[PDB]
Design a protein around this ligand. Structure first.
Ligand SMILES: CNS(=O)(=O)c1ccc(N/C=C2\C(=O)Nc3ccccc32)cc1
Length: 281
């Protein structure tokens, strides 16, 4: 669009490139996403514009010109990944971790109530500002249409084609653990490796802990049998309230995994506050 001046490439995505750009007709700074056009996609994207919430990156406009699609979003200066790297030596203080988690759950609860899944949550999709807020980006873009498998729910890796809102809670749980320990929970480099790293930590699932798991499309009776490890070993500094919530976010059975709404009332958030982080832009 000749109506936008590309400032710089912010990065590539699962559905296109993202640029920081200025709207020559408004002077506004925005995030321009050039998508890499089906009618359903246009309508699916159209719904996302009505999805307004303080913890969701706002979709400002949809420009469909010359059979090409560009999405205009609000712009935030930093993603959680860069923030974690910058805090690698000291770690993110618990009060801030708690604040970010609490806000993300509010965001997810809102999206889920409208039946909008993410299905691709990860640090690069979480944006923060100088105000202490954090927002979900690239929401609901999955349905409308090497990649990291570190945050993928087990039901997805096992071939379930009708996943639910529970897949986002799983990803959030992985991110939660990563902020606390400062290291990826399940850093797999292939689908099977990802699955096995999960099994080696939470134990290989069976019919007892996950009814119907052995009927999943990609389930194999030949999977190695690993025992479950203790969470005190997995996320050390995290207190009992935190470990309790994390475990409910990482239940194998999607139906027993905690929902965003229920997680918001968990004791872990009893003392939540909204600290302002020290950001270097
Ligand atoms: C990786 N470098 S960084 O931290 O400087 C950095 C800076 C800005 C952004 N912003 C990205 C985005 C933004 O603001 N709005 C979006 C809507 C959809 C997808 C990505 C975005 C992401 C990362």
């Amino acid at each position: 669009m000749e109506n936008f001046q590309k400032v710089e490439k912010i990065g590539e995505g699962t559905y296109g490139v993202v640029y920081k750009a200025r709207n020559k007709l408004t002077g506004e700074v925005v995030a321009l996403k050039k998508i890499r056009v089906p009618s359903t996609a246009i309508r699916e994207i159209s719904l996302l514009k009505e999805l307004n919430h303080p913890n969701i990156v706002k979709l400002l406009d949809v420009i469909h010109t010359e059979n090409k699609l560009y999405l205009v979003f609000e712009f935030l200066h930093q993603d959680l990944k860069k923030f974690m790297d910058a805090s690698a030596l000291t770690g993110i203080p618990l009060p801030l971790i708690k604040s970010y988690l609490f806000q993300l759950l509010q965001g997810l609860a809102f999206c889920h109530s409208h039946r909008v899944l993410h299905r691709d949550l990860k640090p690069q999709n979480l944006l923060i500002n100088t105000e202490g807020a954090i927002k979900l980006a690239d929401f609901g873009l999955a349905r409308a249409f090497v990649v990291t498998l570190w945050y993928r729910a087990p039901e997805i890796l096992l071939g379930c084609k009708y996943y639910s809102t529970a897949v986002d809670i799983w990803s959030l749980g992985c991110i939660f653990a990563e902020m606390v320990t400062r290291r990826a929970l399940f850093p797999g480099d292939s689908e099977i490796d990802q699955l096995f790293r999960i099994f080696r930590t939470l134990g290989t699932p069976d019919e007892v802990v996950w009814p119907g798991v052995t009927s999943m499309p990609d389930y194999k009776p030949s999977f190695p049998k690993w025992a479950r490890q203790d969470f005190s070993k997995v996320v050390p500094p995290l207190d009992e309230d935190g470990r309790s919530l994390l475990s409910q976010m990482l239940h194998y059975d999607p139906n027993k995994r905690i929902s965003a709404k229920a997680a918001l009332a968990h004791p872990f958030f009893q003392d939540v506050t909204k600290p302002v982080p020290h950001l270097r832009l």
